[PDB]
């Protein structure tokens, strides 16, 4: 009928030591793809992002290891932050001093929650210009506030033949089309 979580649980925490987290999976997953109401996501490859259901907050972790214990599969991850709701939206706090408890579920992160992580304030959106998309998924759009970029000095580095003049032209031309009354030499 009605389940507490709208996203299908994958594994369960079996052991904890503090700084790192250990996870085992159910025996019915071999294809490294987990499905939800939105689409399909990858969970097992190193460098990806996963989450756990703990109380009224959501914790975000990163996959680093895939080592053998039908055998069992083990995953080691570390925490980077948590997601909270206050009035009608979502805020991402950048502290990881809280850890989940034993037996908690590990869940993937959909495209909706991935947009929130790489986002800024709503009122600063009208005065922002796009830069590009994420490389792992090619679906998220990254914005930047000109108020904070052009306050201190900005450093651009890169080797010969890998697209720095293109970035310079794209960044400089957009501001000119945005604020007619500005000086750049």
């Amino acid at each position: 009928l009605f389940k507490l979580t709208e996203i299908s649980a994958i594994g369960y925490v079996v052991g904890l030591e503090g700084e790192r987290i250990r996870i085992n999976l159910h025996e019915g997953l071999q294809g490294r793809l987990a499905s939800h109401r939105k689409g399909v996501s990858s969970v097992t490859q190193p460098g990806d992002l996963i989450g756990f259901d703990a109380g009224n907050i959501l914790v975000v972790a990163r996959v680093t290891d895939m080592a053998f214990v039908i055998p069992l599969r083990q995953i080691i991850a570390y925490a980077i932050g948590f997601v909270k709701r206050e009035l009608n939206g979502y805020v991402f706090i950048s502290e990881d001093w809280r850890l989940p408890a034993l037996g908690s579920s590990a869940v993937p992160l959909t495209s909706d929650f991935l947009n929130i992580i790489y986002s800024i304030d709503k009122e600063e959106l009208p005065k922002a210009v796009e830069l590009g998309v994420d490389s792992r998924t090619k679906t998220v759009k990254i914005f930047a506030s000109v108020d904070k970029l052009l306050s201190r000095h900005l450093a651009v580095l890169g080797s010969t033949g890998y697209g720095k003049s293109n970035f310079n032209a794209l960044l400089t031309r957009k501001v000119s089309e945005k604020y007619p009354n500005s000086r750049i030499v």
Binding site: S135, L150, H153, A155, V156, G158, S165
Partner: protein
């Protein structure tokens, strides 16, 4: 405010590079060129520095006060852009 572009970050003062609050770092392959970025800030950021050796052409890594968390970005292609290239030898040598 200034914008600094170079391919040899080692040829800059420790003071001039440390004034920046942002660092857009593209592909870099040299042992002596990678110490400046690490030394610009104290510890707590190591996972984002090991990727820089094998980045592709077009993407970049950006971190600073303009980002809540470091982001790996795929930059667009502006149109029209800068000049394509300089003279090419084959066409001139083979005009006849």
């Amino acid at each position: 405010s200034l914008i600094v572009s170079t391919q040899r970050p080692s040829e800059l003062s420790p003071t001039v590079l440390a004034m920046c609050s942002n660092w857009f770092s593209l592909r870099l392959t040299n042992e002596r060129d990678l110490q400046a970025l690490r030394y610009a800030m104290e510890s707590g950021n190591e996972q984002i520095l090991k990727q820089i050796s094998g980045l592709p052409r077009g993407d970049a890594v950006a971190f600073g006060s303009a980002f809540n968390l470091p982001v790996r970005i795929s930059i667009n292609q502006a149109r029209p852009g800068p000049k394509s290239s300089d003279a090419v030898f084959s066409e001139e040598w083979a005009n006849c």
